[PDB]
Amino acid sequence: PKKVLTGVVVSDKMQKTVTVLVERQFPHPLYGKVIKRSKKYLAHDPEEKYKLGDVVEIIESRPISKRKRFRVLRLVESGRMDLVEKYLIRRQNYQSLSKRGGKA
Amino acid sequence: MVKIRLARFGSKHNPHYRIVVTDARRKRDGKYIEKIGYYDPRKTTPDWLKVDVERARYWLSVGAQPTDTARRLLRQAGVFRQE
Amino acid sequence: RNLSALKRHRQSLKRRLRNKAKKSAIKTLSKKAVQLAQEGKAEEALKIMRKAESLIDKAAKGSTLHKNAAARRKSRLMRKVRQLLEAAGAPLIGGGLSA
RNA sequence: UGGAGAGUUUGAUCCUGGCUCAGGGUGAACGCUGGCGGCGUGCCUAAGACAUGCAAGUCGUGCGGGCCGCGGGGUUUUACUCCGUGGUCAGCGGCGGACGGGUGAGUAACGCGUGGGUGACCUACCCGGAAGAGGGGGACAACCCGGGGAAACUCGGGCUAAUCCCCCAUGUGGACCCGCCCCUUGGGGUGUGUCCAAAGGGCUUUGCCCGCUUCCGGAUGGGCCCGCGUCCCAUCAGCUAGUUGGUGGGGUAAUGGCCCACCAAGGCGACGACGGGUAGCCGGUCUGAGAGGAUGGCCGGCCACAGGGGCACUGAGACACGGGCCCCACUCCUACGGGAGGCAGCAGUUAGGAAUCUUCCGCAAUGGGCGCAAGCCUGACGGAGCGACGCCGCUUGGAGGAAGAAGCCCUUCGGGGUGUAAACUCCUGAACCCGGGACGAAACCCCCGACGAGGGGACUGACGGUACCGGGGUAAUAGCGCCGGCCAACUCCGUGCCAGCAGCCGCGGUAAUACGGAGGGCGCGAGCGUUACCCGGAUUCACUGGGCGUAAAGGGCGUGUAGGCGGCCUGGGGCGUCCCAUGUGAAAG
Ligand SMILES: [Mg+2]
Ligand SMILES: [Mg+2]
Ligand SMILES: [Mg+2]
Ligand SMILES: [Mg+2]
Ligand SMILES: [Mg+2]
Ligand SMILES: [Mg+2]
Ligand SMILES: [Mg+2]
Ligand SMILES: [Mg+2]
Ligand SMILES: [Mg+2]
Ligand SMILES: [Mg+2]
Ligand SMILES: [Mg+2]
Ligand SMILES: [Mg+2]
Ligand SMILES: [Mg+2]
Ligand SMILES: [Mg+2]
Ligand SMILES: [Mg+2]
Ligand SMILES: [Mg+2]
Ligand SMILES: [Mg+2]
Ligand SMILES: [Mg+2]
Ligand SMILES: [Mg+2]
Ligand SMILES: [Mg+2]
Ligand SMILES: [Mg+2]
Ligand SMILES: [Mg+2]
Ligand SMILES: [Mg+2]
Ligand SMILES: [Mg+2]
Ligand SMILES: [Mg+2]
Ligand SMILES: [Mg+2]
Ligand SMILES: [Mg+2]
Ligand SMILES: [Mg+2]
Ligand SMILES: [Mg+2]
Ligand SMILES: [Mg+2]
Ligand SMILES: [Mg+2]
Ligand SMILES: [Mg+2]
Ligand SMILES: [Mg+2]
Ligand SMILES: [Mg+2]
Ligand SMILES: [Mg+2]
Ligand SMILES: [Mg+2]
Ligand SMILES: [Mg+2]
Ligand SMILES: [Mg+2]
Ligand SMILES: [Mg+2]
Ligand SMILES: [Mg+2]
Ligand SMILES: [Mg+2]
Ligand SMILES: [Mg+2]
Ligand SMILES: [Mg+2]
Ligand SMILES: [Mg+2]
Ligand SMILES: [Mg+2]
Ligand SMILES: [Mg+2]
Ligand SMILES: [Mg+2]
Ligand SMILES: [Mg+2]
Ligand SMILES: [Mg+2]
Ligand SMILES: [Mg+2]
Ligand SMILES: [Mg+2]
Ligand SMILES: [Mg+2]
Ligand SMILES: [Mg+2]
Ligand SMILES: [Mg+2]
Ligand SMILES: [Mg+2]
Ligand SMILES: [Mg+2]
Ligand SMILES: [Mg+2]
Ligand SMILES: [Mg+2]
Ligand SMILES: [Mg+2]
Ligand SMILES: [Mg+2]
Ligand SMILES: [Mg+2]
Ligand SMILES: [Mg+2]
Ligand SMILES: [Mg+2]
Ligand SMILES: [Mg+2]
Ligand SMILES: [Mg+2]
Ligand SMILES: [Mg+2]
Ligand SMILES: [Mg+2]
Ligand SMILES: [Mg+2]
Ligand SMILES: [Mg+2]
Ligand SMILES: [Mg+2]
C-alpha cells in the first residue's frame, strides 16, 4: 500500500507545494520511554488548495520533483496555527545557538 | 532461460545434489528459485532420489529447461510418465 | 594477443553508422515538418509529417530505436504539428491526423 | 536447562576504586618438539610492480571465398573449361563475450537490511496462445590490383553471397494524434486518419526438423520511487543558488532540477544540517544467564571496483577486468616520426611483512557458451600437492613382573624416592610386503515405438591400483609448560640487591619451596608454550543493573525558551498499548 501519513502544513511559501510536518510516537529501543520524533515532507498541492495550518493526510506517490514524492490526499482537520507556531518557535530558537547571543 | 538442474551440496568425495529451479546465470551453488528434490548418486541410503512431480511439472509448464541429467533424474521419478 | 572481440568491435562500428544516419534522417525531417507548421503550410507539413512517422516506426523495426522510443518521438511530433496548425490551419491533406 | 569468583591500598578494619588473574575465541604469528589419516583452511601488509604458460568462444544446418590435394566430365588429343570430394586458413554473418572467476580501493549512500510502491518501466534466450512470410533493390569484407609505415598498422581502386542492409505489398495485430466510454495519474476499451512486418537453412523431401515476423500472455531477471534501521567528533553550528519549488522543453525503457530556458524565493538544521574522521552492508561469526559487547574472515546475498581520471559506441543488457576513444603515471619496442602493456582470472616471480601454498592432474562428474547433432571451448569446476593452521579420529603397546636391580636423588646413616617403572616371560601386530580391487555412471547418442510416453543397446573415471576387503608381519616417535600466593605440584645444591625472575602481588642483601641446575611432582600431550587481538568476569557507561554531605561527581544564584513531565469526573476518536487471523522472515549456519 502506498504509505499514508498525517501531518501539519507549515509552509505555503512555494507554488503548488505545501510542507507537511509528520510526527511519530514510538518506544525507544534501549531505554523504552516513548519518544516523539518528526520529519518534514514536501507535498504536492496542484490547486494551492490547502492552507497554512491545515491538517492533511499525505500519500506516497510517483515523483513530482526532487524532494517531492508525496501528494496531498484529504483534508483532515481545518486550521490550527498552534502546531505551526510551535514549529515556528522551534526554528526561531536556532538564532541563539551559535558563537554569539543576545536578544532574539 | 530458467533451468532445472543439480546444485552441489555434499563434501569432498561425498556428493549430494539438490534438484533446483534457477535462472541459468547463477553460479551453480548460488541462490536458487526453488528446490524440487535431491539426489545421492552414490545410492548410499535406500532413499537416494526424490522429486515432487507437481512442482517439477509446474516449472516445466513455464519452460524451465532441465539439464541432460536433471531431465534424466526427473524422468526416473516418473515426471514425464503420461499414461 | 589479438582476439575476436576484435571482430565485434569493427562490427559495432558498422551498426553505429546504420543507426547514426537513421536517427539523423528523422531529426532533419521532424524539424522540417514542424518548421513548416509554424508557417501553417498544412498539406505539405502533413506530407512530411507522414514520412517522418514512417522512418520512426521503421528505425524501430530494428535496434536503432525500437520501443516506446518510437512512440515518444512520434507523439512528441504529431503534437507540435497539430498545435502549430492552430494558426488557421485546417489540416488539408489530413494525412497523419485524426479529424 | 539459566548467573561461582580470586589477588592487590591498612599494624589491623569497612567502604570506594583502578589494576591484574582464572573462561571462551582466532585466516594467526613466534619458540621448543613433531609419527599417521579424514575433512576444512591458508598474503591480516603493497587495490605494490609483474617474467612465462593457460584462462571465451562457437556454428558448414546463415554465406561467398583463398591455399595444398584427389577423382569424374565436354574434345579425336591438348590448351582451356564443368562437376564431385579430402585437408587447412581466415572473412562476412548469427548467438555468446554484461555470465562465470577476482578484489574490497571507493562509498555514511535507498549503498545495504527490511517492509512496500510502479496508472512511471524494461527483460535476449525459455513456455503458452493468435496470425503471418508476396514482389523488388542495394552494399561492404573475403578475393583481385596499387601505394605509405621500421613496426603497430594503414590508404586507394575493382569484383561478390547471404538468415547483411533497404524499398513496395499483405494488417492477425501494434504504434501515434484527436474524440467518446469505463477506469482512475500514463489502467482498459473504442471510431476516423496516418504509420509499422518477415529469412532462410536441413533433410530418411508435399512434410517434417531448425530458424524468421507481429501481437497477447507467462516465467526469470532487472530499473526507478518510498516508510523505518545503519559508527565516532559539536574542539564541525550554521548550510544551500540547480540551491527549493512552478511552467514549458530536452532525455530515458520509465519518474524525476536528470539536464535546459523563463519565473517564483525558496529548501535543510540542535530529532545534529554543514564539515571532519573511519568504514563495503548483510545472512552470519565470537562472547554473554540475559540485555548487551565485539566482529563481517570461509560460505551465501547485495553493492562497488579492474593501473589513476573522464567518455560514449555496440547491444535484451555495459559505460563494459582478459571491447573502443582521450588525458595522466609507470614499464617495454623504436629506424625520432611513432607504437605496445595493465594477473584485484589459475599457477608463478618480486617487493613489503611476524606471516600466508603447486608455474600440479582432469574435463570422468556438476555447471556454463555455441551447436540439429556429432562435438568444441571452460584455471568455473571436480581432484591432487604443499603448511600441526584448525577440527576430528589414531599410534608409540598389552597381561605378567621384587619387600623392590643398577644408575640418579634425598636422609635423623636406620633408611626413604623414582618404581611395576625397568629388565625379563608370554600375547597382540602401527609400519612394511603380497593378492583382489571399488562407489561417484547414465544420460547426450543409437535402435524399436511416432522425433512424444515407454522399452532395448553402446560409450565414457582425472581422483587411482587410491578408498575398502583378504593373506603375511616388526614392540615399534614424546614432547612442552608449570611447582611462593592467586593456582593443581617441595626437596638438595649453586649463586649473594649479583646473576637473574616476574600476569598482579612481589622474590635475590649467605641457611632462596620465587633466580640457575638437579632429583621429585603437577598439568596437557603430536603437541606444549609465548606474543597479539575480541567478549567474559566488569552491576567498571549500570535498559536489565551504579552513583554525586566527607570516596570522583549538585551548575555561584536566578529568570525563563525549546523540550520532558502533568490533579479529580464524564463523553468522542483509537495515535501509543493489547489481542486474533494472515503475508514476509531464501539457502547455509
Ligand atoms: Mg541537418
Ligand atoms: Mg517523457
Ligand atoms: Mg591509603
Ligand atoms: Mg601491608
Ligand atoms: Mg586484605
Ligand atoms: Mg577489587
Ligand atoms: Mg561464564
Ligand atoms: Mg622444526
Ligand atoms: Mg589437506
Ligand atoms: Mg589484501
Ligand atoms: Mg585475498
Ligand atoms: Mg586449456
Ligand atoms: Mg580433364
Ligand atoms: Mg570459419
Ligand atoms: Mg564478481
Ligand atoms: Mg551517517
Ligand atoms: Mg562523511
Ligand atoms: Mg539509486
Ligand atoms: Mg510493476
Ligand atoms: Mg510463442
Ligand atoms: Mg538480390
Ligand atoms: Mg549487386
Ligand atoms: Mg573468385
Ligand atoms: Mg601494403
Ligand atoms: Mg572500394
Ligand atoms: Mg489494423
Ligand atoms: Mg483518465
Ligand atoms: Mg487510448
Ligand atoms: Mg484508433
Ligand atoms: Mg510497408
Ligand atoms: Mg524449405
Ligand atoms: Mg516480471
Ligand atoms: Mg532559477
Ligand atoms: Mg521540469
Ligand atoms: Mg535564506
Ligand atoms: Mg575502505
Ligand atoms: Mg554482563
Ligand atoms: Mg565476504
Ligand atoms: Mg594493480
Ligand atoms: Mg542502443
Ligand atoms: Mg587480466
Ligand atoms: Mg602479460
Ligand atoms: Mg622481507
Ligand atoms: Mg565438463
Ligand atoms: Mg557439460
Ligand atoms: Mg607393563
Ligand atoms: Mg607373533
Ligand atoms: Mg592378523
Ligand atoms: Mg559426452
Ligand atoms: Mg524410428
Ligand atoms: Mg531409455
Ligand atoms: Mg616395549
Ligand atoms: Mg598448591
Ligand atoms: Mg654473579
Ligand atoms: Mg599477558
Ligand atoms: Mg642456598
Ligand atoms: Mg635469607
Ligand atoms: Mg626452587
Ligand atoms: Mg613462581
Ligand atoms: Mg558490562
Ligand atoms: Mg560507583
Ligand atoms: Mg569530592
Ligand atoms: Mg548549591
Ligand atoms: Mg563549585
Ligand atoms: Mg514549558
Ligand atoms: Mg493524566
Ligand atoms: Mg502533555
Ligand atoms: Mg474514551
Ligand atoms: Mg491503535
Ligand atoms: Mg534460514
Swiss-Prot record, chain A:
Per its UniProt record, what CDD domains does this chain match? Ribosomal_uS17 (cd00364)
Q: Which GO terms describe its molecular function?
A: rRNA binding; structural constituent of ribosome
Role this protein plays: One of the primary rRNA binding proteins, it binds directly to 16S rRNA where it helps nucleate assembly of the platform and body of the 30S subunit by bringing together and stabilizing interactions between several different RNA helices. The combined cluster of proteins S8, S12 and S17 appears to hold together the shoulder and platform of the 30S subunit.
Q: Which InterPro entries match?
A: NA-bd_OB-fold, Ribosomal_uS17, Ribosomal_uS17_bact/chlr, Ribosomal_uS17_CS
Report the coiled-coil segments.
none
Q: What happens when the gene is disrupted?
A: Increased generation time and a temperature-sensitive phenotype.
Q: Which domain of life is it from?
A: Bacteria
Query: HAMAP family in the record, alphabetically?
Result: Ribosomal_uS17_B
Which species is the source of this protein? Thermus thermophilus (strain ATCC 27634 / DSM 579 / HB8)
Q: Which family does it belong to?
A: Belongs to the universal ribosomal protein uS17 family.
Q: Which Pfam families match?
A: Ribosomal_S17
Which UniProt keyword terms apply here? Answer: Ribonucleoprotein, Ribosomal protein, RNA-binding, rRNA-binding
GO-annotated cellular components: cytosolic small ribosomal subunit
Protein's name in the database: Small ribosomal subunit protein uS17
Under Gene3D superfamilies, the record lists:
Nucleic acid-binding proteins
Q: Summarize the subunit comment.
A: Part of the 30S ribosomal subunit. Contacts protein S12.
Q: Which GO terms describe its biological process?
A: translation
From Swiss-Prot, chain B:
Pfam families recorded: Ribosomal_S16
Q: Name one GO biological process term.
A: translation
Instruction: State the Gene3D superfamilies in the record.
Output: 3.30.1320.10
Which keywords does UniProt give here? Ribonucleoprotein, Ribosomal protein
Source organism, top-level taxon: Bacteria
What is one cellular component GO term in this UniProt entry?
Answer: cytoplasm
Kindly list the GO molecular function terms attached to this UniProt entry.
structural constituent of ribosome
Q: What are the coiled-coil residue ranges?
A: none
Give the InterPro entries listed for this entry: Ribosomal_bS16 (IPR000307), Ribosomal_bS16_dom_sf (IPR023803)
Q: Which PANTHER family does the protein's record reference?
A: 30S RIBOSOMAL PROTEIN S16 (PTHR12919), SMALL RIBOSOMAL SUBUNIT PROTEIN BS16M (PTHR12919:SF20)
How is the subunit organization of this protein annotated in UniProt? Part of the 30S ribosomal subunit.
Q: What does this protein do?
A: Binds to the lower part of the body of the 30S subunit, where it stabilizes two of its domains.
Q: Which family does it belong to?
A: Belongs to the bacterial ribosomal protein bS16 family.
> What's the name of the protein?
Small ribosomal subunit protein bS16
Swiss-Prot record, chain C:
Question: Might you name a Gene Ontology BP term for this protein?
Answer: translation
Q: Name one GO molecular function term.
A: structural constituent of ribosome
- The superkingdom of the source organism is Bacteria
Q: Which InterPro entries match?
A: Ribosomal_bS20, Ribosomal_bS20_sf
Subunit structure, interactors included: Part of the 30S ribosomal subunit.
Alphabetical list of NCBIfam families matching this protein: S20
The protein's job, in short, is:
One of the primary rRNA binding proteins, it binds directly to 16S rRNA where it nucleates assembly of the bottom of the body of the 30S subunit, by binding to several RNA helices of the 16S rRNA.
Q: Which family does it belong to?
A: Belongs to the bacterial ribosomal protein bS20 family.
Query: Know the name of this protein?
Result: Small ribosomal subunit protein bS20
Q: Please name the source species.
A: Thermus thermophilus (strain ATCC 27634 / DSM 579 / HB8)
